Amino acid sequence: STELTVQSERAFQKQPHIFNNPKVKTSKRTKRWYKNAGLGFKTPKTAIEGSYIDKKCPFTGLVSIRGKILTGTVVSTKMHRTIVIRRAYLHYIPKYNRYEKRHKNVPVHVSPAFRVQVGDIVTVGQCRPISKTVRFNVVKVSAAAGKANKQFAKF
Amino acid sequence: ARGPKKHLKRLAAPHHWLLDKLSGCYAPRPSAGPHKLRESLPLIVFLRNRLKYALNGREVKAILMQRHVKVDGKVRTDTTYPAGFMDVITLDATNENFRLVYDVKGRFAVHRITDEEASYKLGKVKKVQLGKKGVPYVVTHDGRTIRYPDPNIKVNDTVKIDLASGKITDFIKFDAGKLVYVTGGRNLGRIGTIVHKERHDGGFDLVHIKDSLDNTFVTRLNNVFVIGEQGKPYISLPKGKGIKLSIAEERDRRRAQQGL
RNA sequence: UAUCUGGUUGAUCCUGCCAGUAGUCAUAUGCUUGUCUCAAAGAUUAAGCCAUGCAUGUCUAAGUAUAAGCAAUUUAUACAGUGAAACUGCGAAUGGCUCAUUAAAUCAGUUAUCGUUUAUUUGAUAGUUCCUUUACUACAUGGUAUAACUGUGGUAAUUCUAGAGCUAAUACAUGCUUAAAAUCUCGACCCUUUGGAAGAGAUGUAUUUAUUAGAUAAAAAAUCAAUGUCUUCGGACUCUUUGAUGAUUCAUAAUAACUUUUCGAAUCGCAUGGCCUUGUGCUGGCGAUGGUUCAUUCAAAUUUCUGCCCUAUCAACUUUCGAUGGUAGGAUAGUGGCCUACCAUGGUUUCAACGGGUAACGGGGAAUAAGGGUUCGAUUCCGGAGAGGGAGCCUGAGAAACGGC
RNA sequence: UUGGCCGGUCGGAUUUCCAACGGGGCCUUUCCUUCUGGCUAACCUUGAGUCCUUGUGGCUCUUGGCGAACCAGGACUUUUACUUUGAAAAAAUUAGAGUGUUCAAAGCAGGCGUAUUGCUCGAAUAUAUUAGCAUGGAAUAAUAGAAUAGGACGUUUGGUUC
RNA sequence: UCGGCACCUUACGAGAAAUCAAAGUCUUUGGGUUCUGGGGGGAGUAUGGUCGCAAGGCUGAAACUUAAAGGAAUUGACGGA
RNA sequence: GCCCGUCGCUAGUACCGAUUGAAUGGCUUAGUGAGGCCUCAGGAUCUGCUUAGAGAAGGGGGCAACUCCAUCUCAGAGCGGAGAAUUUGGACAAACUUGGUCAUUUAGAGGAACUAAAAGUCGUAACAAGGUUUCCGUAGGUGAACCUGCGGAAGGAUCAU
RNA sequence: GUAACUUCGGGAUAAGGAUUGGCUCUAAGGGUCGGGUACGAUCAACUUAGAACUGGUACGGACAAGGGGAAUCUGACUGU
Ligand SMILES: [Mg+2]
Ligand SMILES: [Mg+2]
Ligand SMILES: [Mg+2]
Ligand SMILES: [Mg+2]
Ligand SMILES: [Mg+2]
Ligand SMILES: [Mg+2]
Ligand SMILES: [Mg+2]
Ligand SMILES: [Mg+2]
Ligand SMILES: [Mg+2]
Ligand SMILES: [Mg+2]
Ligand SMILES: [Mg+2]
Ligand SMILES: [Mg+2]
Ligand SMILES: [Mg+2]
Ligand SMILES: [Mg+2]
Ligand SMILES: [Mg+2]
Ligand SMILES: [Mg+2]
Ligand SMILES: [Mg+2]
Ligand SMILES: [Mg+2]
Ligand SMILES: [Mg+2]
Ligand SMILES: [Mg+2]
Ligand SMILES: [Mg+2]
Ligand SMILES: [Mg+2]
Ligand SMILES: [Mg+2]
Ligand SMILES: [Mg+2]
Ligand SMILES: [Mg+2]
Ligand SMILES: [Mg+2]
Ligand SMILES: [Mg+2]
Ligand SMILES: [Mg+2]
Ligand SMILES: [Mg+2]
Ligand SMILES: [Mg+2]
Ligand SMILES: [Mg+2]
Ligand SMILES: [Mg+2]
Ligand SMILES: [Mg+2]
Ligand SMILES: [Mg+2]
Ligand SMILES: [Mg+2]
Ligand SMILES: [Mg+2]
Ligand SMILES: [Mg+2]
Ligand SMILES: [Mg+2]
Ligand SMILES: [Mg+2]
Ligand SMILES: [Mg+2]
Ligand SMILES: [Mg+2]
Ligand SMILES: [Mg+2]
Ligand SMILES: [Mg+2]
Ligand SMILES: [Mg+2]
Ligand SMILES: [Mg+2]
Ligand SMILES: [Mg+2]
Ligand SMILES: [Mg+2]
């Protein structure tokens, strides 16, 4: 993600305390800080060789993953860098000795290292409060095929 | 609300102090100190409710303000001073030294030790950090900060503290084979060294421990205190060696030891 | 202790309710009441109103004693014992009470702080204190300014105070003495150049910014500013300090600066030893109280996940004056629409949102039940909220405190 | 693992005489995500000797020993539900062990000498369910994958960043 | 032979009985699923909403009252059978 | 025998109802807006200094190298600190007024029902083929139970040509 | 912001409540303009929104310009 229009804000977008020296022209020309978030999550190579800034990224941003790891299904991608996932679960009523389908909608920060469409299952990790409602950050996108290539037009 | 609580209701006290339900609304709230509120034993509970040397709290105060008692070498004239695990209480009259260790029912037993064993205590390393000017220190389970430790000392190890100067004499690593004393949970007060240790990145590392009668039990890593190698512990051990017999074995022993 | 019985009919068998029957750590009330143990108790109606009195004050050998207080000091003519008052410190933010508000709110179990503050306790911790050094001032120890007190008063009245005269400090405000080294910056003095040097200053710890280190799969070679220190001047130059975490721009260190420059003991008791320049010289013990930072403890704040009664005669709600998110800032102890500015159009909902009701604080629990359940929980513990109602704030570590304003 | 017979302790240690329950490996076409660097295997291959009196219940400097009996990086992982076991789980209450509160409700005490230089036992245990965490299982019930093959498998090209 | 409208006998079974091859395979109680009911009235009333031109429909209480109302069958008595 | 309704006395219960009815508790638009807090100022005082004018006072080695920290009249151009009343603009915001919307309670002339409920009056609608078989939906008519039209049912008085 | 009622069309500008000047800015909203068998000169207009500053809190500053509501009788309305 070295392209696609990073400097689109009123302020200059950069990572803090990652200095590019204009004097010393060593052949990288854009430094990029990254970390591995831990807990067995691969740092994506789009995060590695990207150019986006995203101060709430788990890899290139100032937040850390610690606490609850959840999984969920993406039901909305209409906010900027934020998604809503759906956590379906079965709740047990003892009296009838039976279950009922409940669900929770969890708003989750998504980095531009991940390309999420709706209908995808993502693994989200707990961070510090990002917004009023957001506390989780996409650490892994677990969509593979989707069963859609045999819906395209043929001869 | 509005600030720190200064009282402790009886029935909100820790159950291992064995306070009688009646005879007061209030339990002695442990002061701030080396150990926690619930992991420790106040001096009034030790001197009135264990040794029976004092009948009141006023007699505990009269004992303490004569500088007879000392905890870990220093005098501690506080009535509700939080004496906890591995703490050494020295009563000068009758020349008594005690090490606070759990009996295997989970409570602080009275364990009389010698003057050689009263010279030292053991401390589980809670963290290893650099202080300022680059000086390394370790932080033990009783709030001690010891500067310039051995660089082999890592977390969850056990140092031996000399208690005349707070210095590390020797230390025991945390690795498979070496004794474990259990200082929390429901296996509280048990002994049995090892099976292995499972890691669980993210939280709550677990230790498998198998005592001398081959009963395995799992404990969290934070409840695990190294006391030595398998055989020859660095401390003396209390009455029972941390075995946790079941209730049928307890009754089969208690019926035996009452008819001579 | 898995039980039924009476009542519809002339009689029968049912469906079905009414009635009986047994409890209630469930209230009230009637009648009666000898003993022992145990003891709930203005919750419900009125979180309605309150006369009176009390419920938070506190002094050790060890902060400050010229009480014109008492007792009658023990080289004790500075003090010395006891000590009202008052200053100072600490507490008054705990306890006790109540259940009005409150329906994802509180609460419960379970997370998190790599998102923060933390008096106290405990442990560790401070040779650097000089502005623009060649413009040092008592450290054998700095300054005034006040209570109590004395005396003159005001007001019907208050835990009201005025003017004047004194005097202290662990109050307030200042202010020094505590090596030696190295490392950097500047620098009067290198001829045919990998050619060198005294001195002068700075360097503790806080604050704030910027920048750097904070590494790491086993071995190797020739090039191009560059003899990158390749000692017989090409006998390849035998070379690695660096902690922790699952994870960090972390711990920590370094450099350049910054600051209505923070701290770095002008304190107190008891004991009075040691030595040689016998000067009351240099030293010197056990404590007390302070003090910076980091830990620790006691907490606190926010937080993750799931779980709450009845109602659709509540189906759409939120979004002007934030609703959902982005960027930046401000504010905060700190995260965060917490607020602001500029953007985008989101967020929730029949898996019941949103609205309404509750004679709803929540839980641990309680009554009863063969089992499954039903009902209750204002009330001994834990958490929350409140102190007639709202709101705002001072002080402090901690209160949006109400026996504070 | 019920025991079961030397009944020799005047109907009281035992053990392959064993059946039946319950686990762990190996082979039968049978994954154990895969290499590294530390183990140097009930030592797959046994230079050298078997003073024990016969047997198929007891051993050594070894011939580089499937360096594979768990410690940390990956050419690293279909997701669950369910169920097992366990951690971590306030006390009080509840169930329940012990104990002549004189009995009992209670309480957590107490008991025993030589009561003159005091001995000693306790204050157990269970339950505490939903949700979360760890763990074994893999029936049951969902889900995933190779069909326009952009499928799988290759220790001995290393190319637009590395 | 499959599919249908039904019928007749029996009662293995079911039911309070009438009756029923479904109204069976139910205290030996679990194939899947929707809707409805909780003694009789007040009452399909009042009120609110909604649809309809209207008549009305759909949704739909409560106060109060009551000890039975009802179902099936038996015997009797009665019938302008 | 049983039985239905109108009408009639008595009591009770709710319902409707003129009254811009009333009371209470929320939320709340707008308006005014106390108070403290932050901030812009302000400077009664209440001071430590210094003075280039008579401050009838050493320039801290010394009454010549323009080079050594040097104080009482009093007016001050030189200051410096502490600082009350007052005050500017903000955010927080009680409270009041006004209007809206929601929740709950209560008064009301009069009206229309229901129940007690068995007794009275008028009839006889239903139960028998109840004397016109009953009942359902719907429409119209009527003192009242009811009657009639249209379609339906048998729970019919027909399981049958 | 907007009630009852309604013939669902209205009632309705219901009722009620804020704002308005000047000056200096800002942001939007056009027309001509072109391609290889990652590019802007140039021209013109008045609408709307926002902001600072300013003033004896004035500002539709003269002029111009609805009073409103709850009901009853009556005729439907517009019209003559
Ligand atoms: Mg946000
Ligand atoms: Mg309290
Ligand atoms: Mg306390
Ligand atoms: Mg009947
Ligand atoms: Mg007596
Ligand atoms: Mg009351
Ligand atoms: Mg009460
Ligand atoms: Mg009190
Ligand atoms: Mg003191
Ligand atoms: Mg204190
Ligand atoms: Mg900023
Ligand atoms: Mg921010
Ligand atoms: Mg934002
Ligand atoms: Mg959402
Ligand atoms: Mg309430
Ligand atoms: Mg409760
Ligand atoms: Mg309660
Ligand atoms: Mg109440
Ligand atoms: Mg309060
Ligand atoms: Mg009151
Ligand atoms: Mg205080
Ligand atoms: Mg208050
Ligand atoms: Mg009071
Ligand atoms: Mg109070
Ligand atoms: Mg007894
Ligand atoms: Mg049957
Ligand atoms: Mg019923
Ligand atoms: Mg009914
Ligand atoms: Mg209606
Ligand atoms: Mg009948
Ligand atoms: Mg009448
Ligand atoms: Mg202030
Ligand atoms: Mg008729
Ligand atoms: Mg007729
Ligand atoms: Mg008739
Ligand atoms: Mg007739
Ligand atoms: Mg007839
Ligand atoms: Mg009629
Ligand atoms: Mg007809
Ligand atoms: Mg018909
Ligand atoms: Mg019927
Ligand atoms: Mg108007
Ligand atoms: Mg009108
Ligand atoms: Mg307005
Ligand atoms: Mg203008
Ligand atoms: Mg008229
Ligand atoms: Mg007209």
Side-chain angles (χ1 to χ4, degrees):
Chain A
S1 162
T2 307
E3 61 95 12
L4 208 47
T5 67
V6 188
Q7 289 304 319
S8 50
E9 314 275 357
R10 278 272 280 131
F12 175 74
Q13 296 290 304
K14 64 180 192 88
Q15 301 166 280
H17 317 309
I18 314 301
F19 176 63
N20 293 340
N21 195 358
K23 288 194 165 205
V24 184
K25 192 146 152 56
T26 302
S27 79
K28 54 177 79 76
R29 282 84 61 87
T30 53
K31 270 182 67 207
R32 187 153 178 93
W33 186 86
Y34 66 75
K35 59 161 169 294
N36 73 314
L39 282 175
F41 295 115
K42 298 292 183 182
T43 312
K45 65 171 75 84
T46 61
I48 301 299
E49 58 92 26
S51 57
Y52 66 87
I53 289 311
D54 200 50
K55 81 172 179 204
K56 303 155 159 175
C57 188
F59 313 107
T60 52
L62 294 173
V63 298
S64 64
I65 303 296
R66 75 287 180 282
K68 297 277 168 79
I69 290 279
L70 322 174
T71 187
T73 315
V74 171
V75 294
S76 193
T77 49
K78 292 181 181 179
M79 314 198 275
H80 187 229
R81 286 161 166 183
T82 311
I83 54 170
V84 176
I85 74 159
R86 200 194 155 100
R87 272 171 53 79
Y89 56 103
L90 280 157
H91 175 239
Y92 180 71
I93 297 89
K95 164 158 180 194
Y96 307 102
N97 297 115
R98 277 165 177 92
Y99 297 94
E100 60 165 278
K101 267 172 201 193
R102 306 219 177 150
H103 84 290
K104 284 295 163 61
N105 272 12
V106 185
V108 172
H109 188 257
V110 65
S111 197
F114 305 106
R115 315 257 69 78
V116 178
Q117 287 70 240
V118 298
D120 298 334
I121 295 95
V122 291
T123 303
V124 309
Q126 185 154 285
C127 50
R128 60 157 189 268
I130 294 301
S131 295
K132 167 166 185 327
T133 70
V134 187
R135 280 101 175 88
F136 288 86
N137 202 357
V138 174
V139 300
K140 177 160 58 201
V141 165
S142 304
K147 269 207 172 185
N149 282 350
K150 306 163 209 183
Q151 295 161 332
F152 288 106
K154 302 144 187 173
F155 285 131
Chain B
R2 275 206 294 155
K5 296 206 189 273
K6 295 162 177 194
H7 295 67
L8 181 68
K9 294 287 180 65
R10 202 179 286 252
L11 315 183
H15 189 252
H16 60 85
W17 300 353
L18 299 169
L19 291 193
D20 58 318
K21 269 207 320 195
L22 314 183
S23 76
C25 304
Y26 295 108
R29 195 182 156 87
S31 309
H35 312 268
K36 297 201 148 283
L37 202 159
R38 311 202 61 85
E39 302 194 9
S40 75
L41 191 60
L43 288 182
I44 179 169
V45 193
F46 189 59
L47 291 155
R48 177 201 49 193
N49 296 116
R50 297 291 96 100
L51 310 184
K52 317 297 181 200
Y53 282 154
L55 305 173
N56 301 327
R58 187 200 49 88
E59 292 181 346
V60 164
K61 198 45 167 182
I63 282 174
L64 280 172
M65 299 285 306
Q66 285 177 353
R67 335 292 303 273
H68 290 145
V69 192
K70 40 184 56 164
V71 183
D72 284 0
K74 320 204 158 293
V75 165
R76 306 310 172 210
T77 77
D78 192 6
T79 295
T80 56
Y81 185 81
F85 185 64
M86 289 303 171
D87 284 21
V88 186
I89 297 89
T90 296
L91 312 188
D92 288 345
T94 61
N95 200 26
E96 298 286 49
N97 315 271
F98 307 96
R99 185 175 310 271
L100 284 189
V101 298
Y102 292 119
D103 67 80
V104 66
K105 296 290 178 69
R107 318 177 304 238
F108 275 124
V110 176
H111 171 53
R112 267 176 202 84
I113 66 178
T114 76
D115 299 69
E116 192 267 313
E117 193 205 331
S119 62
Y120 60 94
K121 81 176 293 169
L122 270 63
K124 175 195 180 168
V125 179
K126 294 316 277 188
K127 41 177 69 173
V128 182
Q129 285 276 351
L130 289 197
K132 302 182 160 301
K133 311 197 198 324
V135 183
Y137 59 93
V138 295
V139 185
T140 64
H141 82 300
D142 54 323
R144 290 188 181 274
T145 287
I146 309 179
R147 284 159 82 83
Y148 295 116
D150 198 290
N152 296 310
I153 295 168
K154 301 288 153 192
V155 287
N156 298 131
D157 296 351
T158 290
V159 302
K160 175 161 140 147
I161 287 154
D162 203 78
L163 290 182
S165 47
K167 302 306 159 288
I168 298 158
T169 307
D170 53 353
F171 71 104
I172 314 98
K173 298 299 281 148
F174 190 88
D175 174 49
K178 289 175 288 298
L179 292 174
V180 162
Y181 185 78
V182 185
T183 66
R186 66 182 294 275
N187 306 305
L188 168 59
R190 287 182 86 185
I191 278 166
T193 73
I194 195 65
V195 171
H196 63 87
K197 176 188 85 188
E198 65 183 1
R199 217 192 180 285
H200 299 314
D201 284 0
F204 307 132
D205 191 286
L206 290 183
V207 181
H208 296 256
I209 302 156
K210 185 208 63 60
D211 70 306
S212 280
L213 294 174
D214 291 331
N215 314 123
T216 45
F217 53 101
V218 186
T219 314
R220 274 187 193 186
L221 182 62
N222 63 6
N223 280 308
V224 167
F225 183 77
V226 167
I227 46 178
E229 66 272 63
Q230 194 177 2
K232 192 177 155 46
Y234 285 23
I235 60 165
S236 289
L237 293 197
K239 291 177 70 68
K241 300 294 187 291
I243 298 296
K244 192 259 285 180
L245 316 172
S246 68
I247 53 175
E249 283 83 337
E250 295 295 333
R251 83 165 159 204
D252 278 20
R253 183 180 63 83
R254 293 179 181 177
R255 269 73 174 272
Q257 62 85 211
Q258 72 178 235
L260 282 72

